[PDB]
Ligand binder design. Structure first.
Ligand code: QX4
Lengths: 134, 141
């Protein structure tokens, strides 16, 4: 009933089906993830919905906003709390090996789409002590 | 030290002062020439108000960092009910993330937050924190 989200999920599944790495552990801890940002608010939201369908084993934050980085020139730098218009979401995962596969799959999927979707960025991230999701 | 009207300061200002005191013990690099955002601390739990105060105090204490807004965590094992797929369901537990340019400073800040919140009453003392690492950095705008 949501063909847009399901079609993104299918694109992701086709890429993910080409690898067979473990997505869960007996420990069950949330120790890795992918950090997904840019594009546009709507395109990121749509990707998030498709990720949820394609990967039951993950957990997702809502969209939120990124702060600014460094400003060029002699100043002023932005305050740490200032919010940009660029959005992000986090995917929590139980294995780093699958985080790497998902990062590769997102990169491969979005590059086949027109802007702004192709401007979505992704990096693997790790959590030293895990995140105790409730 | 400075004292506001009536002999008290806001909680976020006292957090800033506490963080400044703890961080002053560690003379580690906070920035790099490359200027890339490769590390962070992920802060969660407590309550929305206690995280709000911690976030505001961290910003006041550390100009070299960048912070996300407060947001909400998904569930772990066995998510709560909802019409949407399990991975998307939101708990009532909140979080924010601090981005940093060095891994050592993320470690120092993680330890400072842990030490500071342990001195505060519940629910602030229930705040949790882990260092995180971004393999390719985050290209903040
Ligand atoms: C793979 C992907 C991700 C997000 C998207 O977001 C959109 O708005 C339209 C899409 O075709 C799309 C595709």
């Amino acid at each position: 009933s949501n063909p847009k989200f399901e079609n993104i999920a299918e694109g992701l599944r086709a890429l993910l089906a080409r690898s067979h790495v473990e997505r869960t552990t007996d420990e069950g801890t949330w120790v890795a993830g992918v950090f997904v940002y840019g594009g546009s608010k709507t395109s990121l939201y749509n990707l998030r919905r498709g990720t949820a369908l394609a990967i039951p084993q993950c957990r997702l934050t809502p969209l939120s906003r990124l702060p600014f980085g460094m400003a060029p020139g002699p100043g002023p730098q932005p305050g740490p709390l200032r919010e940009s218009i660029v959005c992000y979401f986090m995917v929590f995962l139980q294995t780093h090996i699958f985080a790497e596969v998902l990062k590769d799959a997102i990169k491969d999927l979005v590059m086949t789409k027109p802007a702004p979707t192709c401007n979505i960025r992704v990096t693997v991230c790790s959590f030293d002590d895990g995140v105790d999701l409730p």
